[PDB]
Amino acid sequence: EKHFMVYYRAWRDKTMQGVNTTLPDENWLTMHDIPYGIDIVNVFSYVPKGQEALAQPFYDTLKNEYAPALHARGVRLVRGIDYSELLKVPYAGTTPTEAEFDAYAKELLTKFVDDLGIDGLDIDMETRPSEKDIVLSNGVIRALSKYIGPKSGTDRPFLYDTNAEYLPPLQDVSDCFDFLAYQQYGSDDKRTQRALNNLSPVLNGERFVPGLTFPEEQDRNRWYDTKEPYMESNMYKVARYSYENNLGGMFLYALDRDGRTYNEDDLNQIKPSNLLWTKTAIAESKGVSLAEMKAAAQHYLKRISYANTDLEAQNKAAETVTQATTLYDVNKAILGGDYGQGLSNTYDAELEKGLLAIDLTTLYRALDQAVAAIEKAESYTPETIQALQTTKESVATELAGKTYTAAQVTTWQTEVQTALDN
Ligand SMILES: [Cl-]
Ligand SMILES: [Cl-]
Ligand SMILES: [Zn+2]
Ligand SMILES: [Zn+2]
Ligand SMILES: [Zn+2]
Ligand SMILES: [Zn+2]
């Protein structure tokens, strides 16, 4: 029932080069790299005038590749429009008619959502609108609720995005939204409690989703939501508070900057991330038990052991998982503190929790026989061992990949047994 949302900066996708940035650095991720356990992805895009041609490959890829792929994983896509867009509703009289509100709601969805291959909409409200404005926005939001959000009967999200608790533009239409996304960058769970109290006349806690940020390059602002020790960080405190108090979930802004700082190196550089903090916040906000976290990590360690040749790092990771006392420490035991510092750059505990339900014991017995039938190759036909080593290395490599299906496992089982049965 809970939510975990991330804001994905479109101009930091690999398909964009030189959009909305003075940095020449190559982008390092695609939307395929978004971690598991994230059920809503907000595509946040700013395209400066003149860069529309540079940004088009991303939009084509979003519509034709990224959105189908994320839908296959159960993820829904949204994007935001500024509250001011609602106030441009055309009308003939002194105020719009029900039909004029409805006409405009359909126009908004077509332009900003449907044409992009996106599923739903956020309203970004970070001002203090007038009473005249709210008559307009109330009508437009009410008209939109027939098509998206809880009142529509559909699975299309309708979200309200804000960094304050300004009630007038919300209190008449709060029932139209799946949840409120509350930006509280830089602040701990004391602010989470206060903000929810202030919003409680119009919003229940289960539909309140607090959010933190990662440090953005070149930013004049300073919001420090990650730090070690882990339990001193805002990312622990807010994720824990959301879980402890049955809130709607959590969100994170700027997925691509997971682990970055505002130091002189990070402030002007685009670098790969092991996504440690996001993967940890997903687990923490859902209250994953330490036992379950360790079980997933040990599952990963065993399945990569047949292709991975670094026995020292595998051993240190297994020991570090055993000593871990926080969800962060389990993840860090495999991912390291930063990209390339651990045994893996891609381990994903939510993904791996899914794979626990697929039995590997038959495949492990087959691969173990193959390994035994390599250590004593001096006792067999080299023309048969070669056909086994080729098949074994292939299955080992694929078994250590991103993910696999139960049907895929039986295929590797048959392949390995066949090579041994000859
Ligand atoms: Cl639908
Ligand atoms: Cl839909
Ligand atoms: Zn927004
Ligand atoms: Zn639908
Ligand atoms: Zn990064
Ligand atoms: Zn990753």
Author numbering: 61 to 482
The study reports:
EndoE-GH18L crystallized in the P 6 5 space group with one molecule in the asymmetric unit and diffracted to a maximum resolution of 1.7 Å. The high quality of the electron density maps allowed us to trace residues 61–482. The GH18 domain (residues 61–349) adopts the conserved (β/α)8-barrel topology with an overall size of 45 × 46 × 38 Å. A large groove contains the active site. This groove is located at the center of the (β/α)8-barrel and surrounded by the loops connecting β1–α1 (loop 1; residues 70–90, pink), β2–α2 (loop 2; residues 105–111, brown), β3–α3 (loop 3; residues 143–157, orange), β4–α4 (loop 4; residues 185–190, light green), β5–α5 (loop 5; residues 223–227, blue), β6–α6 (loop 6; residues 244–248, green), β7–α7 (loop 7; residues 274–293, light blue), and β8–α8 (loop 8; residues 314–335, red). The floor of this groove is composed of a set of aromatic residues including Y67, W71, F104, Y245, and Y313. The crystal structure of the EndoE-GH18L construct revealed that the linker region folds into two three α-helical bundle (3HB) domains connected by an additional α-helix. The first 3HB domain comprises helices α9, α10 and α11 (3HB-1; residues 350–395), whereas the second 3HB domain covers helices α13, α14, and α15 (3HB-2; residues 421–482). Both 3HB-1 and 3HB-2 domains are connected by a short α-helix, α12 (residues 409–417). The GH18 and 3HB-1 domains interact with each other through an extensive contact area of ca. 972 Å2, representing 7% of the total accessible surface of the isolated domains.
Here we focus on EndoE, a multi-modular glycoside hydrolase secreted by Enterococcus faecalis, one of the leading causes of healthcare-associated infections. We provide X-ray crystal structures of EndoE, which show an architecture composed of four domains, including GH18 and GH20 glycoside hydrolases connected by two consecutive three α-helical bundles. We determine that the GH20 domain is an exo-β-1,2-N-acetylglucosaminidase, whereas the GH18 domain is an endo-β-1,4-N-acetylglucosaminidase that exclusively processes the central core of complex-type or high-mannose-type N-glycans. Both glycoside hydrolase domains act in a concerted manner to process diverse N-glycans on glycoproteins, including therapeutic IgG antibodies.
